[model samples]
Target: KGEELFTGVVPILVELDGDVNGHKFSVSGEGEGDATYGKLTLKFISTTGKLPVPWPTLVTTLVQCFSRYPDHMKRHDFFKSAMPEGYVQERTISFKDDGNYKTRAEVKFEGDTLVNRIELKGIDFKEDGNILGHKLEYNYNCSNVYIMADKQKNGIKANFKTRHNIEDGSVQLADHYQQNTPIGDGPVLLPDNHYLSTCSALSKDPNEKRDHMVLLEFVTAAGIT
Candidate 1:
């Protein structure tokens, strides 16, 4: 299995040539894997454009998503609680890249059920070139399974898992994200949320590669069931 580990590799880069300061830029992230989490590398390249503003906006957005959303926050808490009975060690690394005026933050967590690390990087430019973008690449191995019905009576249910892997990066310009099956009653109560779900390569031809977005919505009056 280790021999075929590098069988597939996807490369991606983004370039922005327009106004952005205080313009409300947006970035999103999603992943899937098995019980053992994988490594992810996020690369940010800023063209000689406006001075690169530290990526605090993007980082804060991610942190908020993990802590503010009930479903998301619950998963985080579950991971924290499910950690080994007696294990305590957390480390964080932060630094700036003098070459490109980039800043990075790397976090490491150790425990049972979940052992992973995440790296976030951003670059700023003092001159005008042609590219300015942030990239997020990481591997995850989720293993817990938690499913619950929607309390709002929207006829939608939430299926949770701890291990899954989803990674398909091939794009030039555009946003990319993923979504799982609809929470409504369906033939499969707990469908695979990996690449088999939305925003995955499962639906694409074996030779197709492009950036895409997966949007999900739940409704009862629409007769989706």
Candidate 2:
């Protein structure tokens, strides 16, 4: 009933299939309206297809191990429970903020927006997770959007527009009469007592009625429903 979005899908982070292990594109809308989001579904696999009960090559920070496989534990359903064998308090992701989201996945929620900045290693798996090949990151920039709705339209229309930004994160300089391919404009005849109901009420004033038809011409010029 209130909010709106300018860009359909802002630039989050376009990931490669191998970087996250069999997972690729992952992005969610930052809160231009409604709920915000994060992106990416990351997983590390053992090509040898077996990493034993306890994963070695351990990163001191990622001591948490999980008995369940990666697929069994979805990113959205992750929490800080800790690994039994290892000396850690959380496995894979330990969500931040309110703790509803763990940043270990491809997508992690940050306030109203989504960000994909997760890196994990030496995750002890009770079973092999991906066990595939490896991939890297091809980082991209977030758009230059303030992200808000046009309050003028009320609920009659959702004329959603960015606050003031573009895909490159640069400002789209503002101007009242900037002529942004923006159009500027005409006509019709009708009987005085024809009993018409339009932008202008049906009346004897021919000029007022004339303006109504001209407005209709403006609508026609736009040519979009």
Please report the TM-score between candidate 1 and the true structure.
0.20
Give the per-residue lDDT digits (tens) of candidate 2, residues 111-188. 433333333332222222212111111121121111111123210111111122233553322111100010111011
State which candidate has the highest TM-score. Answer: 1
Q: Write down the lDDT that model 1 would get.
A: 0.23
Model 2 ranges off by over 4 Å: 1-7, 14-114, 125-225
lDDT of all predictions: 0.23, 0.18
User: Which residue ranges in model 1 land beyond 4 Å of their true spot?
Assistant: 1-18, 21-36, 59-225
At residue 122, candidate 2 shows an lDDT of 27
TM-score of each: 0.20, 0.17
Residue 1 displacement in candidate 2 (angstroms)? 11
Q: Write the per-residue lDDT of candidate 1 for residues 64-89, one digit (tens) a residue.
A: 01111122223222112212221111
| Residue 70, candidate 1: C-alpha displacement in angstroms | 21
